[PDB]
Paper text:
The DYRK1A structure was determined from a construct expressing residues 127–485 of human DYRK1A (National Center for Biotechnology Information [NCBI] genInfo identifier [gi] number 18765758). The structure was determined in complex with the ATP-competitive inhibitor (S)-N-(5-(4-amino-2-(3-chlorophenyl)butanamido)-1H-indazol-3-yl)benzamide at 2.40 Å resolution. In DYRK1A, the ATP-mimetic inhibitor DJM2005 binds to the ATP binding site, forming three hydrogen bonds with the hinge backbone and an additional two hydrogen bonds from the inhibitor’s primary amine with the side chains of Asn292 and the DFG motif aspartate Asp307. Interestingly, the inhibitor’s primary amine also interacts with a sulfate molecule from the DYRK1A crystallization buffer that is found in a similar location as an autophosphorylated serine residue in DYRK2 (pS159).
The dual-specificity tyrosine-phosphorylation-regulated kinases (DYRKs) are an evolutionarily conserved family of kinases with five human members (DYRK1A, DYRK1B, DYRK2, DYRK3, and DYRK4). They belong to the CMGC family of serine/threonine (S/T) kinases and are categorized as class I (DYRK1A and DYRK1B) and class II (DYRK2, DYRK3, and DYRK4) DYRKs. DYRKs rapidly autoactivate during folding by phosphorylation on the second tyrosine residue of the conserved activation loop YxY motif (Tyr321 of DYRK1A).
Author numbering: 135 to 481
The structure:
Amino acid sequence: VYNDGYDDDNYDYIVKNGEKWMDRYEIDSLIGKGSFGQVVKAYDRVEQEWVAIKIIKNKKAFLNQAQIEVRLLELMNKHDTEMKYYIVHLKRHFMFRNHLCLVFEMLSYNLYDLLRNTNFRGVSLNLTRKFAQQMCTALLFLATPELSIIHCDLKPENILLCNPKRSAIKIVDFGSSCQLGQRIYQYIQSRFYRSPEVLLGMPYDLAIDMWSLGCILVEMHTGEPLFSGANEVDQMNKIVEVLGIPPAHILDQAPKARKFFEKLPDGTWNLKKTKDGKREYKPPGTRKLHNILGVETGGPGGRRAGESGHTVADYLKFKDLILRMLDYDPKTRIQPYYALQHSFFKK
Ligand SMILES: NCC[C@H](C(=O)Nc1ccc2[nH]nc(NC(=O)c3ccccc3)c2c1)c1cccc(Cl)c1
Ligand SMILES: [Cl-]
């Protein structure tokens, strides 16, 4: 028996359709599972609305981290400006049957579900621009000095539509987030969206979220992850195919440089030597975003040829923004305020 029969063997609450909690919430059903717990849909009798309840796993390490999440959600939800409306709203939280429960405003499907719905053809450049703009505005809000919040797990599954037929989005899952100067983990971010500084074991700041955004925006237009590594070695090799070897000044300070690269007597770096015969990656920097995006050939896979809103000029602007978001140097990587001034967003 776990938690007196209330929990399964993975620390999760065994959800039961129709259950009424605290003479207030009427559980409709389980609507998602993840590493930190479950999200159920529930009707709130007192406020008379549908809400999403995240039931955190009944396990100390999960509980203690989720408490950092709550503090951050409360700090974001109360901070004064209107940019705060890109962040999901925590309505309240309580303990129930030894689980921490967070009650959220109801939202629709995530950006991954949207892509799946197009059969991974990708969404239009116009829709991509709308998501990009909203996300940069969310990132500008997190960068406001009082908050200085690093999300740490930006990816299509954590950006949700408010309404399934409309373009407005919100960011969820601050379960791994921290504030600048309160960093506690080293292996963070989903692998495909993971930044080079984290791969390399280096100190990291808010710039890691802009790296993830760049990866996300390409994926949303092409339908396909930009850097789809099966593990860390493979993830760094895939980044290198597109962007080249990272600059000497970063690798010279990187504790995990030698997991992926080796230093030559001249002071320059290469990828680590591999078995004779064993070709697997394109040579450094020869997989061009120019071709992935199909800038001059009708978009990703030619699928946008002779469509409105997908001109060569449009694509050149989009490509420039993306490369500025995928700068290897977290100190010169484009910051949210300047990204919003990019010609890609001109009216
Ligand atoms: N890294 C995944 C973060 C998600 C997540 O979707 N969290 C949400 C937070 C707040 C929220 N408010 N409304 C939501 N809507 C849905 O979950 C949903 C599901 C299916 C179809 C429409 C909407 C959601 C979802 C998640 C999913 C499953 C379990 C957890 Cl513990 C977290
Ligand atoms: Cl969440």
